[PDB]
C-alpha cells in the first residue's frame, strides 16, 4: 500500500473479486451457502447469500436477496441472483440487482449492497441490517475473508 491508490471500485464476476491495481484476489464461494444467510429486524427478515440465489421456501431460488416482512408478512426480492463482487478501496462489497421496485422517482428495482468489513476477528461473517430501506439496502457483514 502506497496510500496513493485512487478510491476505485473493482468488480469481479461469479463469486470472486480480484483487483489488478492492488493485486488482491478473493473468492467468497466457500463463504457462500446454498442454504443462505438470514438477518432479522422487527420489520423484516432478510435472506441473503454471497453469490447466486438464496434458498427460502417463500422466495424464488433465482433471487439472491429476499426480505420477508414480519409485521406485514409480505415478501420482496431485493435482487435477483447475482454473483458480482466488488472491491472499493479495500472494502469488499456485494451488489444485488433486479429486486422488486418501489415508489421512487427514478423507479429503480430494489438493490442490496453488502459491505464486507473485516473488523478485528470474524469468520465467514454474519450479515446485519443497517437501517436503510429507503432504497439501497446496505448490509453490515463482518468477515475475516475481507482481510488479505
Amino acid at each position: 500500500e502506497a496510500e496513493a491508490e485512487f478510491l476505485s471500485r473493482t468488480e469481479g464476476d461469479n463469486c470472486t473479486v480480484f483487483d489488478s491495481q492492488a493485486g488482491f484476489s478473493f473468492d467468497l464461494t466457500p463463504l457462500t451457502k446454498k442454504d443462505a444467510y438470514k438477518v432479522e429486524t422487527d420489520k423484516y427478515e432478510f435472506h441473503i447469500n454471497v453469490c447466486g440465489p438464496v434458498s427460502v421456501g417463500a422466495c424464488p431460488p433465482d433471487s439472491g436477496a429476499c426480505q420477508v416482512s414480519r409485521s406485514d408478512r409480505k415478501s420482496w426480492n431485493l435482487g435477483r441472483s447475482n454473483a458480482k463482487l466488488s472491491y472499493y478501496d479495500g472494502m469488499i462489497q456485494l451488489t444485488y440487482r433486479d429486486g422488486t421496485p418501489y415508489n421512487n422517482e427514478k423507479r429503480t428495482p430494489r438493490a442490496t449492497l453488502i459491505t464486507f468489513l473485516c473488523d478485528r476477528d470474524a469468520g465467514v461473517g454474519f450479515p446485519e441490517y443497517q437501517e436503510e430501506d429507503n432504497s439501497t439496502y446496505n448490509f453490515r457483514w463482518y468477515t475475516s475473508y475481507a482481510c488479505p
Side-chain angles (χ1 to χ4, degrees):
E1 298 67 278
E3 296 187 76
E5 300 71 278
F6 180 78
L7 66 178
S8 51
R9 183 177 61 189
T10 308
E11 298 179 85
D13 184 279
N14 184 30
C15 304
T16 57
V17 52
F18 60 95
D19 189 284
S20 305
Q21 304 145 91
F24 179 91
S25 52
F26 262 89
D27 61 275
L28 303 182
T29 314
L31 206 174
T32 302
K33 303 190 179 302
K34 61 178 183 179
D35 181 71
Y37 293 76
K38 56 77 63 176
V39 187
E40 59 178 80
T41 58
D42 295 89
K43 298 186 299 183
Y44 314 105
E45 61 175 277
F46 304 87
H47 296 264
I48 311 179
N49 191 24
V50 184
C51 62
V54 298
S55 184
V56 183
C59 303
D62 186 76
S63 59
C66 181
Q67 62 178 330
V68 182
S69 178
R70 300 178 64 202
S71 304
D72 184 61
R73 300 179 181 203
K74 292 180 182 180
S75 52
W76 300 267
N77 293 331
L78 303 82
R80 186 174 186 186
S81 53
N82 164 88
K84 294 175 61 286
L85 297 183
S86 303
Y87 194 68
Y88 178 73
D89 189 73
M91 299 180 298
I92 299 173
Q93 305 189 272
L94 209 188
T95 307
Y96 282 100
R97 61 184 302 155
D98 190 71
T100 307
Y102 30 82
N103 294 329
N104 185 28
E105 304 182 276
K106 67 177 66 178
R107 60 279 299 183
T108 180
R110 194 170 315 236
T112 309
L113 184 162
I114 296 65
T115 305
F116 303 100
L117 300 178
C118 181
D119 183 77
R120 183 56 281 142
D121 289 275
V124 294
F126 182 80
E128 297 190 277
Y129 182 62
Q130 289 276 89
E131 58 184 80
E132 301 174 76
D133 70 88
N134 64 329
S135 54
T136 309
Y137 294 63
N138 187 271
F139 285 89
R140 195 68 171 199
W141 189 309
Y142 300 98
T143 177
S144 183
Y145 293 82
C147 281

